[PDB]
């Protein structure tokens, strides 16, 4: 509705619609993860080495080939898994039989 | 230096605690009040926490 | 003493169960219905529960 002769004062930054949008987006984000797998079995020491491929200078080193012992369907079984990680997702700690752990464990 | 009133009230216990990593354990040495622990299965130095 | 109609319906299964304590284990056995278990890794005696 055009409201032909109405002049009104607006003030963004003091607008509470922003805060509601903020809270609803974050809430929906969190709700979407409720039924998803929690990767707690993966907070183990890793054994990380370099990638066996043609890596350009811009990628040096950027990726690591990490092996680890993952849990499996049965509690009395364990499996060897390896995967690629970005350097930014791992931290160069541990310093035992192995090299690196996941950033947020 | 424990007064008579406190004899047997505190115990110095050592347990293996979990750690940040699933495959690692640590060794922690803490004081407990006697009322929070219970001795078990005829072992002189073996205790468990009251409500496990 | 199993009648003909029940042959193969029940199995006597042994397993290592957890206990109240993280560092203590117990041997448990129980009877299961055949419909609740599945054979695995080509072993006559090796079974697991259907929903793992």
């Amino acid at each position, epitope marked *: 509705i055009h409201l032909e002769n109405v002049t009104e004062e607006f003030n963004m930054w003091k607008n509470n619609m922003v805060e509601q949008m903020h809270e609803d987006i974050i809430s929906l984000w969190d709700q979407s993860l409720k039924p998803c797998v929690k990767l707690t079995p993966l907070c183990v020491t890793l054994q990380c080495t370099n990638v066996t491929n043609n890596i350009t200078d811009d990628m040096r080193g950027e990726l690591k080939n990490c092996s680890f012992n993952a849990t499996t369907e049965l509690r009395n079984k*364990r499996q060897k898994v390896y995967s690629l990680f970005y350097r930014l997702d791992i931290v160069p700690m541990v310093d035992l039989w192995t090299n690196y752990r996941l950033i947020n464990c | 230096n424990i007064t008579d009133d406190m004899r047997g009230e505190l115990k110095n216990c050592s347990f293996n605690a979990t750690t940040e990593l699933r495959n690692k354990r640590q060794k922690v040495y803490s004081l407990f009040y006697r009322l929070d622990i219970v001795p078990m299965v005829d072992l002189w130095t073996n205790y468990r926490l009251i409500n496990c | 003493n199993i009648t003909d109609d029940m042959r193969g319906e029940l199995k006597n299964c042994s397993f290592n169960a957890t206990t109240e304590l993280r560092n203590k284990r117990q041997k448990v056995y129980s009877l299961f219905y055949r419909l609740d278990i599945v054979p695995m890794v080509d072993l006559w005696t090796n079974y697991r529960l259907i929903n793992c």
Partner: antibody
Amino acid sequence: EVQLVESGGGLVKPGGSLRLSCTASGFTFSNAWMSWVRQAPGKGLEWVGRIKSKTEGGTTDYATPVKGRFTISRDDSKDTLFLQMNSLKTEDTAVYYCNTGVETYDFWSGYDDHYYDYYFRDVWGKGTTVTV
Amino acid sequence: EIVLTQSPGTLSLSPGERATLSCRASQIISSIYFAWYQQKPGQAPRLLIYGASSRATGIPDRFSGSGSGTDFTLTISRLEPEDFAVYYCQQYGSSFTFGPGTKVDI
């Protein structure tokens, strides 16, 4: 690759002092107990002493024949072990070695201590000398 | 102090033979505190067996052993070139002393 990098040895006389030390390589020392053993030429192995980590409380243990003149200390923070010698006897020439045990438990699950792969690594340094 | 002695002082066996070594503590020290090393001349000693039972990391399965009070034994099921070294037993009876060293020779 648990290594002990041993250094600081050399030619000394009884009327002096010497400090030998080992520094961690690969695997750290704040989580390990260390000891010294010496072997004079033509002799068997003689334990000098052992010091625990500052965790249990830097407690030391020494063989009777080396007490007082041979003491042991740790830095822990810089991963360095020391054998401190002062006013030695003419009986003290030997190759001294540092050593440590490494007890590593790989647990299969964060819920049940029943399943693990346990490994025990006995690690020795190269050997340095104390002389007469 | 703790005194350990060894026997025979020298072993003379061909590769492929069972080079059994024995040693004795003067003190009765429980087997839980028993260790047996192999020292290649010029090298630091290397633990073979601890707790008079469990095998150390890396150590070949030709090595085994046992013992009780003062009586301890080391078994090499088949002698190999890698075993021609001087062996030492050690007892962690609050003073971790060692025997004089036993030579395995041919």
